[PDB]
């Protein structure tokens, strides 16, 4: 069917895309980078995350597949060697789609809304001064946040920047998003729940500024200085990214590959 | 209908279970603590522990009331000011019934099985040596975890000692468990993930011994040491517990005011 | 004699100054903001960092007090009140002097050298992209930090940002710094310490640019972005910031006054 | 001079310890195990350890040596093929000594008084039931502990269990203790400092029982179930440990090559 290859632009994953397309012309396969149906990102989870958004208006017509050319990537997870096998078992189709949950993110101004969508998390810092938001959860006050940042999470996001925080590893077949914090200041007057929080679909998660406005707004790779903000809006989406799925990876097999040994 | 009252066992909750009793006799209900339909504990967490375990049988036709006589208590979420408003709430019935998911404990032995059910979660220790077990997930080997022990919380649990432990607090409308670590070694030799892991239903979580088959394995308040071990398993029980809900009390609020501020 | 004396602003610091300023007119004392031998800050802690840094040419000729108009102040460690009687006190003299480590953070570029002495911490983040430097201890490489940023403080200084960051609370007659990582990436292939570390007076840290050479770094509330960085060295500073003390209030009951109870 | 060497047993380090004992016969030195002025430990820094405690009443007049006949040992640092290098070089002596800070752990009952001294840590633990116990400072009450336990390092035992448990590694040349939690209970009426704390010499920290007094408590690989304890004392020993050194080794680079790679 339709497909597009995107690759990292370093000679070895150029060249490994020019082979697939030479492959993929000895099947009924067109290349259509307008409206594909099978996105293939060659190079690492930068190179996957980039496709991810490159894209993020079809992905309910869209199956992904990653191939990481460095060490193993947590969303690329085909190697060079197996792209000729690759080639083959796309142009026969009949592969199963797996789907892993989004993050939602809605930023309200004075004064109109922006949405965004992350495949491994939405931060928030504030633009240079103190960072202090007030975080209220389905409209009820749950905190008020002093500290570096905040850290909105999906389940695929959970071995990112989430692990980092001291965040859990969570299933991607949890419909949730998990919230971490960035070095809260803790001390009698001030105070944070400290501990990861993990919400189901249909929980809305709101930050609201307290005295400064502008934040700076991480949706994935991407970082924007918003300013004039009202209002920071997390929820699960009800949208979902599909991969092609080829054979037997489980989630917990990748986790233990990636940081435990391989 | 038929109901019970239990109590901590100091005067002052011996009398608010004496005073809700003549209260109840004002009306169609009939003490039973055989064949209850629902279940008040009066004192604290410990306290509504010890009621769960007492009717772990038939929890499907119970539903669970705790009211804390000391500071809140995070089960036990009526005050004692308020037993009378609950008497004739409970009287008139037409409540709803909210449930939250357990965990299932299976240890076996060598030349039977023991099951457990945990409503907080559910640690394996040691008997006093090392502590060497492999972390087996839907039997693919995970890590060997080297240290003082493992903890496995429901979603209520999480704000119990799955939160000492570093672990994320999970909505308990989420159907998991979450694995935390106590105290891992990890040097270029031994190695885990280090980060709690939040497992969806119908996965299972193996813990193998490598050299000694004795352990201290605690369900909630109950430890008692176990020999011979050739396995634990761990997966969120097809059970559920019940609870009688009579007004809005949302888990982030009760964790807002059992952390933040009250 | 010679004194001088900051305010926070606010009027309620403004006033205190003033009638201190009017206390000591009572006695022989001169007031010179220019040659001071006592500096009184009146304020918080953000007020007492000010005060450090507008006289840290002249440190061994100096005794600080804080006076603090908010809640407790870890430096400024006199209730509003009791002015009077530090008037008093401050006029007669015989106090005895106690002096805490300081922190010397060298900046060397390519084709001069900066130095900066901190009272609470340094700090060293990237100008934007990704953060990496390698950590050169006594000119041993130690390991590749990938992360958001390192964090070096003084031991007055690890209640502060250290503390958040998860290190170790350490008495001030200890002299040394410690090293706290913000948010590490670690997998199979990017490995740091994750500790923190603690070092004697002598030892030498040294953060080397690994490709990007800008970086943004503090020491305490100040925050420049330095271009075509070389080096970034740490060490205990030989200079010691000194405090007038009047009555015992041991470092341990601060920490317990500050973030147990009060 | 007067040696002796302790073995792990094995085959393999009972052949090392017969050829180096046959190696020092072609020398000046006498094989005594009751009053050894040099003790060689061969195995891992458990024999290394249980070296220390075999000779502890005679640690100023003996110069310590670990060999590792598994993976890098930290106090057990030369390597099985450098024993020939190792004999000759103690032989001739003429090396220099580095000394290592101890931690003396005195615990007082009703109705006498025990001292032990640790090279890595002492721990307290319940005895079955809740750990609750009230943690004083040079006098001064600083926290009501409830959790698992406590731990308390010396610098060179900060890599050991203190490691586990969160706290800071710190240089040996600092004189100093790290006491750090085990899973601490922390809501709105139950609270800790959380942070590790890092103590100077002459600083004494004195844990005193709320309820139970029956307490395990473990130095180094002991651990002994003690009653009727009325209190625990932790301060940092007079005596230290000292190593025979002969070639740089740095503390640093033995982290580095533990924790990072060699
Ligand atoms: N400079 C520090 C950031 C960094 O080196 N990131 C790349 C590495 O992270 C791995 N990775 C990615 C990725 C990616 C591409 N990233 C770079 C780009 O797009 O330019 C953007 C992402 O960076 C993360 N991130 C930012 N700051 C971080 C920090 N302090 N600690 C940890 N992660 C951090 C955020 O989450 C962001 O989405 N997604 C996942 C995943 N779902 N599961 C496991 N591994 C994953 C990837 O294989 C590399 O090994
Ligand atoms: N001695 C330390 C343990 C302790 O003081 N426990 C009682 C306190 O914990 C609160 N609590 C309970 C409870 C209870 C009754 N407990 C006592 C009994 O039944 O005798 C047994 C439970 O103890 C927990 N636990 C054990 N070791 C712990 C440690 N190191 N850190 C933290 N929790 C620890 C385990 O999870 C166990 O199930 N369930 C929850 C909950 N789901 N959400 C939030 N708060 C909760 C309760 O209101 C008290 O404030
Ligand atoms: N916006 C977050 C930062 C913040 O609110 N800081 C003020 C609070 O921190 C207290 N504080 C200070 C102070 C101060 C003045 N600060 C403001 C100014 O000068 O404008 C600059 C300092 O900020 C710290 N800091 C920065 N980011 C932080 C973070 N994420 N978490 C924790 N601390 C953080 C750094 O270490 C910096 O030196 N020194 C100490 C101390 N040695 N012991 C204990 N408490 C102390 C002070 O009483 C306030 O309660
Ligand atoms: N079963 C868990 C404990 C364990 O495997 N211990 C051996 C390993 O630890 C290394 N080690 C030792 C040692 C030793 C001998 N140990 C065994 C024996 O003597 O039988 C007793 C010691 O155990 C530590 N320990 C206990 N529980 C722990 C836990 N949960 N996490 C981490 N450490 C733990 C305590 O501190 C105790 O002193 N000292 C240091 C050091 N100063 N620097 C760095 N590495 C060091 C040694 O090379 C092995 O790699």
Same mark, same amino acid.
């Given at each position: 069917? !339709? ?6 632009? %370093? &000679?070895?994953? %150029? ?5 697939? #397309?030479?492959?993929?012309? @000895?099947?009924?396969?067109? $290349? ?14 930068? *190179? ?8 993020? /208006?079809?992905? %309910? &017509?869209?199956?992904? #597949? ?8 947590? $969303?690329?997870?085909?190697?060079? +060697? &197996? ?20 993050? !939602? ?6 004064? !109109? @809304? +922006? ?5 491994? @998390? ?17 409209? #009820?006050?749950? &905190? ?9 999470? *999906?389940?695929?996001?959970? *071995?990112? $920047? ?20 960035? +070095? ?44 004039? =903000?009202?209002?920071?809006? $997390? /929820? =699960?989406?009800? !949208?979902?990214?599909?991969? +092609? ?9 990748? =986790?233990? %590959?990636?940081? #435990?040994?391989?």
């Amino acid at each position: 069917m !339709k497909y597009m290859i995107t690759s990292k632009g %370093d &000679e070895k994953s %150029d060249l490994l895309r020019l082979n697939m #397309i030479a492959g993929f012309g @000895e099947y009924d396969m067109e $290349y259509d980078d307008v409206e594909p149906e099978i996105v293939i990102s060659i190079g690492g989870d930068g *190179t996957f995350l980039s496709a991810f958004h490159q894209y993020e /208006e079809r992905l %309910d &017509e869209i199956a992904f #597949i990653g191939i990481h050319t460095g060490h193993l990537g947590f $969303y690329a997870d085909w190697r060079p +060697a &197996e792209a000729d096998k690759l080639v083959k078992l796309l142009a026969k189709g009949e592969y199963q789609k797996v789907s892993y949950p989004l993050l !939602k993110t809605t930023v309200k101004y004075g004064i !109109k @809304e +922006a949405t965004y969508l992350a495949l491994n @998390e939405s931060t928030v810092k504030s633009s240079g001064g103190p960072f202090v938001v007030d975080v209220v959860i389905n409209d #009820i006050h749950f &905190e008020r946040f002093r500290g570096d940042g905040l850290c909105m999470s *999906t389940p695929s996001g959970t *071995t990112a $920047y989430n692990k980092s925080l001291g965040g859990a590893l969570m299933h991607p077949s949890i419909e949730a998003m998990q919230l971490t914090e960035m +070095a809260s200041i803790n001390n009698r007057v001030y105070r944070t729940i400290g501990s990861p929080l993990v919400f189901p679909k249909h929980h809305v998660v709101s930050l609201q500024p307290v005295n400064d406005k502008d934040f700076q707004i991480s949706v994935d790779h991407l970082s924007i200085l918003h300013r004039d =903000v009202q209002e920071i809006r $997390y /929820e =699960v989406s009800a !949208k979902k990214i599909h991969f +092609a799925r080829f054979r037997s990876f489980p989630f917990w097999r990748r =986790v233990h %590959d990636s940081f #435990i040994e391989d």
